Design a protein around this nucleic acid. Structure first.
Lengths: 107, 138, 101, 151, 68, 210, 50
RNA sequence: GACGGAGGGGUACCACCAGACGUGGAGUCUGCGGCUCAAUCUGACUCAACGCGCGCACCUCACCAGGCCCGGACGCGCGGAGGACCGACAGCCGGGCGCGCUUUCGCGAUCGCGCGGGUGGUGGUGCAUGGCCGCUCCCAGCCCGUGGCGCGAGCCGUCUGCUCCAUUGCGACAACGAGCGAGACCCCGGCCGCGGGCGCCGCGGGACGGCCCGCGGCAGCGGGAGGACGGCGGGGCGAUAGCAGGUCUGUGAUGCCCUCAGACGCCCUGGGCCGCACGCGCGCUACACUGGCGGGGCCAGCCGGCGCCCGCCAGGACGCGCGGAGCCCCCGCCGUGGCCGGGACCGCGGGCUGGAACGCCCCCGCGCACCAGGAAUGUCUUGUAGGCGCCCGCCCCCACCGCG
């Protein structure tokens, strides 16, 4: 199955940055907003719902990302064990932190 | 007012006899052949149906006045239902072409001068139609 | 002061909640020349579903109705003054406040 | 048509002195009286003019039982909206009769004169609570059901 | 006719004897307002109060007519 | 009469209510185990301010507060929320015995581990009975033990299961714990005669002459 | 590949909103929620039996 | 307990009577049964199945005829990167889809296998079972503490008097206190008042069996008057206990069990449920004379937008945001003629919308049966029955259905 490594690595990053994903499940052809990438042709493109699910499931199956299912939606909550594996794919660095890592404290 | 005192039936029938001497409107031939409505069972046998319709629109027009009545509006005064089907009848409109000619012709005689959402009577016409009513009651 | 006319409209499910938000907008606005509140005709949202999930039985039907009441308040004030009024107004969560310039 | 500010919306200036409501079968007729020259016109329309000509004789009941000196001189402009057709006439009748009553005003025993009109026609001064009922699941109409196949 | 429950009559019974004061014997109108001092009883709805306020007119009438 | 019947916001308000049902489902999906009981979002100033009334607030924050706005961030993919524009008011819910959804989780989570059904339900009845609730319905059903319904109801008070006021002092929590044999269903109820913001119709307090 | 006929049909494929069921979409007010699904989610949207 | 062609009381237009409109007879339609077909997807089957599961040209869609496609996650064992996979112009086969061929072109482990495992499924069992619903149920009973009576099953209160729709009370009682049903409560009217207001719409109050007369142990009980309204407005919520009632075919409600890649997975293309003696289970329109059919005075309440211009309409264009029924009532035309009653069947066109009519409407033929319905049935007491129209649900399309 051909899933671009640029779709893969950028997709992993969108999930990693917000530590979150909410997709109304689509059976077949779909475009997922919030994730955009660069093709080999330098074109800005959005990934496919069929392809995205095949990776989404794989990362919750690896156990890297916790997932919920409310009828027709996937709610992804990334795990700390997951953050290390995401860094092992993205070629990014340990210091980089998911954007919700801190700062929501309410006084 | 005496235009609200002339019974609608008396006003409409009496007005068209001098409208016949007047030569106003000029009812066309295809219209006097066609049957009014998309729900009527068969054509009205009035023969002068177009001329009798013309006395019907301009009287209800006096009451409508400034608010205005569009092409659908005068069709509303004569709205009917089909009387012949195995299944129940849902209400439908009358014919648009015959109604569009009656107030468009009335615009031509200058009794009706209209420029708003659909049609309004020129004051000269409102006064004159009211004047026919002034003759009708007393 | 570019006294803009603002129309404030409030749509809410509960009459008890709606009256409280309406009172705050009237209460906050006495300093700003607030026009008195306009009560909307109730907006019925009836949905009728036969209660039985399956087809068994004389179908009995659930008429589920949601009542919407909307409130119109005209205010002639500066753009900031409604914001100062906002801190004083008691905010009931989920009730809608609509600022119509 | 429905409970609007149509009570006086049509007329501006010439404030008509009396405002009297008449209601039969979801039909609203507010009676406006100016005590003129025998204008009993309601719906800006003559008393003789009616949807059912035969029905007009019933709407002349205060005129026959109560003194005609009342209807000899009066002034009227009534806004009737709502009602099938005959509902409008009884509502009109409630309006005008209450409108004559409002004119009597000062005499304390106004009710005693009015009760001669109640004795000849009850509900001529009173409004009925009769209103359309509702259907229920399985019922084509308000008080029926689909014909039952087995007892 | 109308027949009310034990609690409705018993509340009225408590109101007419345990706090007789002067609930009205033959008049409904004083009774309409004399049953709402808040301490004397707390119940919601005017008609529900009116149910006690109905029997009270007969119970006080009975006591005036003879000992209950 | 001159106003559009196409009032666009009139439809928008109900959208917030399906947002409320989706939020209820969202938190029911795993945060009900975390303790979620009730929710209220506020989009009046586009704050998207949501109150998660819940049995214990600390569970979502965990130890770093990382996932606290991740729940808002999950809603960020769905509704373009910003971390901190949206807020999660997960606070303390007191008298948790009165709370129903988690009270019945407290019981069927214990029944997942597997323990006497009667004993588990009875302790649940007492700990809410302690809160002043005369009757708590520990209604169970489903394929209990021997194959068949074997439904057992456990009740200790004068709960009114009928009437419009019934919903005022009562709550319902539909919960299923699945034995390997299958779904065991539990519906729970609670008693609040002393509403303190309104009056139960039957309650006649009464008074004395002096 | 399969993309040539992949879901080529263009017609409503509307489904119940809460569920994945296709029937009884009930789009009366734009609530694309399901009918059997609706009974489970009516009070939260504000509809009540009254 | 349950039965009883046992008795003693209650009560309900689901019972009946005085009546009413029926239905069954006629045509037409929709849903069954029973047939036929490659296929007619099915569940239900006395009330408590049968215009019902929310509007099948496609989708839905379950079924039939054809084929594409993997979406066999995660771990190890392999094969092994200029070699895992995957795309392909013509010439095709083939509706067709580079599916697979001839072909000579591109890819670049993104992975293919082996396993173990995930993998969906309107696929079976609702006598695995959740939830929810039908019914019992125009229908009031249920049980607890303490004390009594009994070896105990159980009694007692919870009642062989009266009253109430109703253990609904009032009296009286080895029971005495509690409760849960019924009530109360809530929703909309009968009316009014206060604040207001665009959209007459939010908040109060008010008919209380209160009072009169007669009877009432008393609760109640008639006859009454005032009075918006007479002793629940029209509605909802509804105990204990059940049922092997219904639904695994709504579902992230699911157990066991099956099909797991020539799939019961999932996409496309054409079907079918719109086929189909008779029989039915609702409906609908008729049989004309209080009827037609007639132009032409109209009138709403749900709560709803209109204009202009061509076209008989159907509709179409060009636009602006804006607005209402039928029956009946009018004067007429009209003889008792299957009629100018009825509107079927069905030729000929005009359109609509939809990928596509096999959907639908209008115009113009045509004038089916049927001239008052046998047994045997229903459903209802005031704004009620009937009669007559509007809106929605579903829906590109399309109501006779249902909620109103």
């Amino acid at each position: 199955v051909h899933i671009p490594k640029a779709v893969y690595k950028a997709v992993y990053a969108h999930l990693y940055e917000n530590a979150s994903l909410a997709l109304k499940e689509y059976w077949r052809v779909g475009n997922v907003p919030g994730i955009t990438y660069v093709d080999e042709n330098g074109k800005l493109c959005n990934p496919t719902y069929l392809h995205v699910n095949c990776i989404m499931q794989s990362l919750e199956s690896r156990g890297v990302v916790k997932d919920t299912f409310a009828w027709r939606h996937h709610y992804y909550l990334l795990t700390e064990k997951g953050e290390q594996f995401i860094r092992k794919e993205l070629d990014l660095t340990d210091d980089v932190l998911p954007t919700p890592y801190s700062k929501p404290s309410i006084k | 007012s005496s235009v609200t005192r002339v019974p609608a039936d008396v006003f409409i029938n009496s007005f068209a006899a001098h409208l016949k001497n007047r030569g106003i409107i000029k009812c066309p031939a295809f219209t006097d052949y066609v049957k009014t409505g998309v729900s009527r069972q068969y054509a009205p046998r009035d023969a002068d149906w177009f001329y009798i319709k013309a006395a019907s629109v301009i009287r209800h027009f006096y009451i409508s006045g400034s608010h205005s009545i569009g092409v659908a509006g005068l069709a509303r005064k004569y709205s009917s239902l089909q009387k012949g089907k195995t299944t129940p009848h849902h209400t439908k409109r009358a014919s648009c072409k015959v109604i569009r000619s009656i107030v468009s012709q009335f615009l031509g005689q200058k009794l009706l001068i209209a420029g708003e959402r659909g049609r309004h009577i020129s004051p000269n016409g409102r006064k004159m139609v009211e004047d026919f009513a002034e003759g009708l009651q007393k | 002061d570019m006294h803009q006319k603002y129309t404030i409209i409030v749509v809410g499910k509960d009459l008890k909640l709606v009256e409280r938000y309406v009172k705050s907008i009237v209460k906050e606005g006495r300093a700003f020349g607030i026009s008195g509140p306009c009560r909307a005709p109730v907006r019925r949202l009836t949905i009728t579903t036969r209660k039985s999930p399956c087809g068994e039985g004389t179908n009995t039907w659930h008429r589920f109705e949601l009542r919407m009441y909307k409130r119109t308040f005209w205010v002639t004030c500066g753009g900031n003054d409604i914001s100062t009024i906002l801190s004083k107004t008691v905010v009931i969560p989920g009730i809608q406040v609509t600022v119509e310039v | 048509d429905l409970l609007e500010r149509n009570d006086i919306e049509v007329r501006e200036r010439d404030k008509y002195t009396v405002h009297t409501l008449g209601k039969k079968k979801n039909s609203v007729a507010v009676a406006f009286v100016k005590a003129g020259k025998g204008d009993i016109l309601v719906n800006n329309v003559p008393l003789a003019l009616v949807r059912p000509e035969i029905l007009r004789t019933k709407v002349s009941e205060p005129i026959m039982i109560l003194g005609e000196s009342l209807f000899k001189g009066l002034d009227m402009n009534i806004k009737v909206a709502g009602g099938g057709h005959v509902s409008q006439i009884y509502a009109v009748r409630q309006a005008i009769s209450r409108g004559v009553l409002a004119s009597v005003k000062d005499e304390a025993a106004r009710s005693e004169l009015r009760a001669k009109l109640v004795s000849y026609d009850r509900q001529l001064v009173v409004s009925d609570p009769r209103r359309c009922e509702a259907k229920k699941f399985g019922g084509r109409g308000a008080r029926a059901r689909r014909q039952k196949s087995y007892r | 006719g109308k027949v009310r429950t034990k609690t409705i009559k018993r509340a009225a019974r408590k109101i007419v004897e345990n706090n007789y004061e002067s609930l009205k014997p033959k008049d409904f109108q004083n009774n309409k307002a004399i049953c709402s001092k808040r301490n004397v009883a707390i119940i919601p709805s005017k008609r529900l109060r009116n149910k006690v306020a109905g029997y009270v007119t007969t119970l006080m009438n009975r006591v005036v007519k003879g000992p209950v | 009469v001159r106003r559009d019947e196409e009032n666009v916001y009139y439809s928008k308000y109900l959208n917030d209510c399906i947002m409320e049902a989706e939020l209820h489902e969202f938190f029911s999906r795993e945060l009900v185990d975390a303790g979620y009981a009730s929710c209220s979002l506020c989009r009046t100033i586009d704050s998207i301010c949501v109150i998660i009334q819940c049995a214990e607030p600390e569970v979502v924050m965990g130890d770093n507060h990382y996932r606290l706005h991740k729940i808002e961030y999950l809603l960020a993919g769905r509704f373009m929320c910003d971390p901190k524009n949206f807020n999660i008011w997960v606070d303390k819910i007191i008298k948790r015995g009165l709370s129903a959804e988690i009270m019945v989780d407290n019981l069927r989570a214990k029944l997942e581990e597997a323990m006497p059904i009667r004993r588990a339900a009875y302790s649940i009845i007492r700990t809410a009975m302690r809160a002043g609730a005369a009757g708590c319905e520990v209604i169970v059903a489903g394929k209990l033990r021997a194959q068949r319904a074997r439904a057992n109801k456990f009740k200790e008070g004068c709960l009114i299961s009928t009437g419009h006021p019934k919903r005022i002092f009562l709550a319902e929590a539909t919960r299923h714990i699945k034995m390997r044999q299958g779904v065991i269903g539990v519906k729970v109820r609670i008693y609040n005669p002393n509403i303190r913001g309104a009056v139960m119709p039957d309650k006649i307090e009464i008074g004395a002459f002096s | 590949m399969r993309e040539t006929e992949f879901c080529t049909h263009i017609a409503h494929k509307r489904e119940c909103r809460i569920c994945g069921n296709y029937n009884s979409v009930y789009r009366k007010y734009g609530l694309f929620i399901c009918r059997r699904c609706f009974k489970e989610n009516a009070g939260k949207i504000g509809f009540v039996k009254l």
